[PDB]
């Protein structure tokens, strides 16, 4: 609760400290990529990923510096329809790949 | 059929075992796992499979198959960052001090830094200064208590220290004790251009003749060609 | 040369004498080039080892791998002896990682030096055809974190110190200077925030109360740290009391065109009518009344030079032999760049503010500013190399 409560409130120097605590060490590793990010919006939609608050993770992404960051979180999440509609708007040089993985998720699915 | 995140997460941990990273994608995916899935992309820009299952691993919790890996691949760079990201910070430093030497100097900074945030100023001052970063770290720690900085300065007897308190002093405006450190760390440009400054122009001259410095000497110049 | 025990027995006694070039004379005569080259190596010859390793080229890592390690137990000669090695790729790593490592623990004054010795490696490595574009790429890429980097370290010194050294109008500039020149990727430890708040503080101590006002609202899209929350609040509330215009003796004037720009230019460091670059000096980065030329085509950079010393009694500035003749070599600087780039031109257009250049880094300065720094430090502040290198 505490841990999930540095993460609303961006405290990610805290956030750090409570997790290394957990022993979370994946976490701990992931947090110290993002600790030099100050841009609010971008912060905020890793830290609401962390979360696994997704559409306010690509909200929050759509409005920060890098919006293909939500493209990329779509994708690694494998919500290939959702990743399709950002690659449209924000990289369409990406569609014939995002869809290659697609197509080989499908042809496994059938 | 299963939908059961549970399923998904135990056959991660059997793709670490594995060391099928395409499945292990897969899996982070259904799972929900998406920082998981983010480290595994940022891996590939490493060309050893067993550290990116090290990376795997490290995002399942399996910090012993981690450690396991991580010695196997001989990245004692990475070992060290994980024992770090893993609170082992004694562990840390004997790896740093015997394969990754030159990551021993930040090791050291990062744990004065863990040590400063645990309110243990005593054990972080001595790390800052095996870090060689005390000439900075130091004088922001202890911003907040004047007292043990100046025995701190005074104790170190170091001429940038002696030059950062001079410089300290002087601007809460008591030059007389700004002298005194200025004389300490030699520092005769600065003893010259404060006298300067209190208008006592022929004992800048007295300094500037005795101890030959350029720098000085310079200052005294422009100070008399602006007169 | 049929009496082995007694050659042998007279060859390592010569060794044990310290007598190497004999012992080699004998062990040479008995055709050992094996324990020739131990001998040079143990006896530390190692300017004979080298003539050797150059000899017979099988030699070259048994020379310099142990001379590499020794200097770097003893990072810059190992960096040396990687270059020495011809493993450049490798240097470049070893000097990125300890890059990283000085940026990580906040000495951005190692890094700026770090990243313009990486750039001067580039350009070393761009002498090949075959790496040119990709490695010139590289060159300006690190050539500008250098100088982001010794920027950053007087605003980071001045946030973390509770007094400063630097001038309220050098922040100011420094300040400016890293918003233009700053990407949409930040690099690496270096703070908008503390730039943005730092900027801020110094615009409200100068009369810039819009520019501050904007920097306060630029502050409010970012995440800001608690340690300086407070701050930020109080001169947010403080700045609206203040008049809405900017002091018009902060205003950058072109001097090519006369045209005053804006406090923040949204195109970087160019001038917003002739999209002439702004050059700054490395110690207080005002604007410097410079002005980049270039040579018309057929006149070589050798014959440049003789027409600017023989003194008789965007669109790029293109200079004839005649005007080149009629300039005071007072009035012309010049950047002499390692070979696959041209040599650069400078005009001063105010012959009475003496300007100053490094002859290694090439950086320009206030004259009265670098010869102050320089006899301060004992060398060029940029470069850390003593007045008694006038090379590249």
Redesign the interface.
């Known amino acids: 609760e505490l841990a999930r409560a540095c993460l609303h409130h961006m405290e990610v120097e805290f956030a750090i400290r409570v997790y290394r605590r957990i022993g979370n060490v994946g976490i701990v590793m992931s947090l110290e990529q993002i600790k030099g990010i100050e841009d609010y919006n971008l912060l905020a939609g890793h830290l609401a990923m962390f979360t696994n608050d997704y559409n306010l993770a690509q909200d929050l992404y759509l409005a920060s510096s890098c919006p293909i960051a939500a493209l990329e979180m779509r994708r690694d999440l494998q919500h290939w329809d959702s990743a399709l509609q950002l690659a449209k708007h924000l990289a369409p040089d990406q569609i014939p790949f995002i869809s290659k993985e697609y197509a080989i998720q499908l042809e496994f699915a059938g | 059929l299963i939908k059961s995140e549970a399923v998904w997460e135990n056959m991660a941990r059997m793709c670490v075992k594995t060391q099928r990273l395409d499945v292990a994608k897969?899996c982070?995916?259904?799972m929900?796992h998406?920082?998981?899935?983010?480290?595994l992309?940022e891996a590939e820009q490493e060309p050893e499979l067993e550290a990116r299952v090290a990376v795997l691993a490290?995002?399942?919790?399996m910090?012993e198959d981690?450690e396991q890996l991580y010695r196997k691949c001989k990245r004692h760079d990475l070992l060290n960052?994980?024992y770090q990201?893993?609170?082992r910070w004694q562990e840390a430093l004997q790896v740093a001090e015997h394969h990754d030497r030159?990551?021993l100097?930040?090791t050291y900074?990062?744990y004065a830094g863990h040590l400063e945030?645990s309110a243990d100023c005593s054990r972080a001052l001595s790390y800052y200064e095996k870090?060689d970063?005390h000439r900075?770290?130091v004088?922001?720690m202890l911003?907040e208590d004047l007292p043990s900085l100046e025995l701190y300065v005074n104790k170190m007897k170091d001429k940038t220290l002696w030059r950062?308190w001079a410089?300290?002093l002087?601007?809460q405006g008591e030059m007389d004790a700004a002298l005194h450190y200025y004389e300490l760390a030699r520092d005769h440009?600065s003893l010259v251009r404060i006298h300067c400054f209190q208008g006592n122009v022929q004992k800048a001259a007295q300094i500037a003749n005795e101890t030959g410095n350029?720098?000085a000497s310079?200052?005294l110049a422009?100070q008399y060609e602006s007169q | 040369k049929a009496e082995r025990e007694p050659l042998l027995l007279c060859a390592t006694y010569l060794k044990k004498l310290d007598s190497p070039g004999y012992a080699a004379e004998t062990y040479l005569k008995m055709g050992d080039l094996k324990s020739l080259v131990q001998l040079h190596v143990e006896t530390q010859r190692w300017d004979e080892a080298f003539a050797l390793g150059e000899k017979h080229p099988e030699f070259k890592d048994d020379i310099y791998m142990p001379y590499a390690q020794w200097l770097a137990e003893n990072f810059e000669e190992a960096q040396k002896a990687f270059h020495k090695a011809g493993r450049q790729r490798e240097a470049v790593q070893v000097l990125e990682q300890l890059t990283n490592n000085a940026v990580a623990e906040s000495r951005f004054n190692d890094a700026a030096y770090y990243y313009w010795m990486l750039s001067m490696q580039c350009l070393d490595i761009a002498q090949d055809p075959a790496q040119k574009d990709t490695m010139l790429g590289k060159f300006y890429h690190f050539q500008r974190l250098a100088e982001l980097y010794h920027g950053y370290h007087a605003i980071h010194r001045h946030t973390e110190d509770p007094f400063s050294v630097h001038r309220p109008e050098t922040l100011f500039n420094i300040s400016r200077f890293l918003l233009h020149s700053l990407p949409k990727d930040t690099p690496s430890g270096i703070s908008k925030v503390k730039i943005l708040f730092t900027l801020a503080k110094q615009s409200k101590a100068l009369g810039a109360y819009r520019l501050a006002r904007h920097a306060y609202d630029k502050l409010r899209g970012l995440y800001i740290p608690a340690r300086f929350q407070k701050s930020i609040e109080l001169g947010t509330l403080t700045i609206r009391a203040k008049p809405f215009h900017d002091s018009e003796e902060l205003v950058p004037l072109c001097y090519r065109c006369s045209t005053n720009n804006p406090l923040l230019n949204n195109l970087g460091n160019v001038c917003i009518n002739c999209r002439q670059p702004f050059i700054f000096s490395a110690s207080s980065y005002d604007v410097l009344h410079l002005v980049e030329f270039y040579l018309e085509e057929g006149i070589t950079d050798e014959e440049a030079i003789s027409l600017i010393d023989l003194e008789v009694l965007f669109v790029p500035v293109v200079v004839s032999r005649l005007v080149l003749r009629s300039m005071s070599r007072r009035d012309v600087l010049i950047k002499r760049w390692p070979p696959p780039l041209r040599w650069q031109y400078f005009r001063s257009l105010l012959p009475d503010a003496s300007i100053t250049m490094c002859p290694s880094c090439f950086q320009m300065f206030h004259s009265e500013d670098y010869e102050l720094l320089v006899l301060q430090h004992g060398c060029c502040p940029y470069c850390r190399r003593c007045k008694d290198d006038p090379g590249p």
Not at chain 2, 34 to 39: F, I, P, T, V
Not at chain 2, 58 to 61: D, R
């Open positions: 897969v982070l995916g259904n929900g998406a920082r998981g899935a983010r480290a992309r490290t995002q399942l919790g910090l981690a960052k994980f990201a893993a609170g030159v990551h100097r930040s900074h990062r945030a870090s970063t900075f770290e004088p922001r911003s950062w410089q300290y002087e601007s440009f350029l720098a310079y200052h422009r």
